[PDB]
Amino acid sequence: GLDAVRKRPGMYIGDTDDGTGLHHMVFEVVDNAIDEALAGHCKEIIVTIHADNSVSVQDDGRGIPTGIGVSAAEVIMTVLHAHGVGVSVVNALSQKLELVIQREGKIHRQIYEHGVPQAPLAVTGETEKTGTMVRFWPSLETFTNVTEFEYEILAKRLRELSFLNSGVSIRLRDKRDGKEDHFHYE
């Protein structure tokens, strides 16, 4: 797993030099979010392009199962297959990834670096909401040439996903210039 995806990134995520793979990192995370909506638990997904060239995806689904050794969420984030290659591949190809889960009345947080957790999933507070939030900074040792996220590419796929999932609200936000969109087609 981990190490092997790192050694041959292209085979799993696509062209690492023309931007195809870069944007598909985002799509893989969104697809995971889409599932929680297809399951009948998620109603709105928010995708954000931060000014430090990172992307975050948040939803209001159940939240990735926590609790145990390692929590079920850590297994999902670090074990290959524990088009959809998983967040585990996205995590291994990110120089930094931030994971936040709201489930069973608690706020859980964890940081990853090139797929390795700096520490175990920790509880940092109470909450009465549920949902998952993943924010990742693409590894510049893997991705070359096109290294910055393009809004139009994201907007194009997010719209098609909206039409194929009538009912789920999808919002796109660019913090680099204030652009924003809301897809909710019929």
Q: Which residues are catalytic?
A: 28
Which one of residues 90, 134, 161, 170 is an interface residue with ligand CBN (CB under 6 A)? 134
Q: Which residue has the tokens 């967040």?
A: 87
Q: Does 146 bind ligand CBN (CB under 6 A)?
A: no
Which one of residues 6, 62, 96, 109 is an interface residue with ligand CBN (CB under 6 A)? 62
Size of the site for ligand CBN (CB under 6 A): 18
Q: Does 55 bind ligand CBN (CB under 6 A)?
A: no
Q: How far apart are CA 54 and CA 136, in angstroms?
A: 6
Q: What share of the chain is helix, strand, coil (3-state, %, to 5)?
A: 30, 30, 40
Which one of residues 76, 100, 107, 153 is an interface residue with ligand CBN (CB under 6 A)? 76
Residue 17 Cβ, how far from ligand CBN at the closest point, in Å? 26
Q: Does 105 bind ligand CBN (CB under 6 A)?
A: no
Q: Does 171 bind ligand CBN (CB under 6 A)?
A: no
Q: How far apart are CA 43 and CA 88, in angstroms?
A: 24
Residue among 120, 139, 29, 27 nearest 75 (CA): 120
Nearer to ligand CBN, 91 or 142 (CB): 91
**Which amino acid is it at 68?**
I
* DSSP β-bridge partners for residue 101: 108, 132
Binding span for ligand CBN by CB under 6 A among 89-97, 110-118, 131-139, 175-183 = 131-139
Q: Contact, 81 vs 88, CB < 8 A? A: yes
Pairing of strands 106-113, 122-126: antiparallel
Cβ neighbours, 10 Å, residue 156: 12
Q: How far apart are CA 156 and CA 105, in angstroms?
A: 36
Q: Does 101 bind ligand CBN (CB under 6 A)?
A: no
Which one of residues 5, 49, 64, 97 is an interface residue with ligand CBN (CB under 6 A)? 64
Q: Does 32 bind ligand CBN (CB under 6 A)?
A: yes
The contact set with ligand CBN (CB under 6 A) reads 29, 32-33, 35-36, 57-59, 61-62, 64-65, 72, 76, 87, 132-134
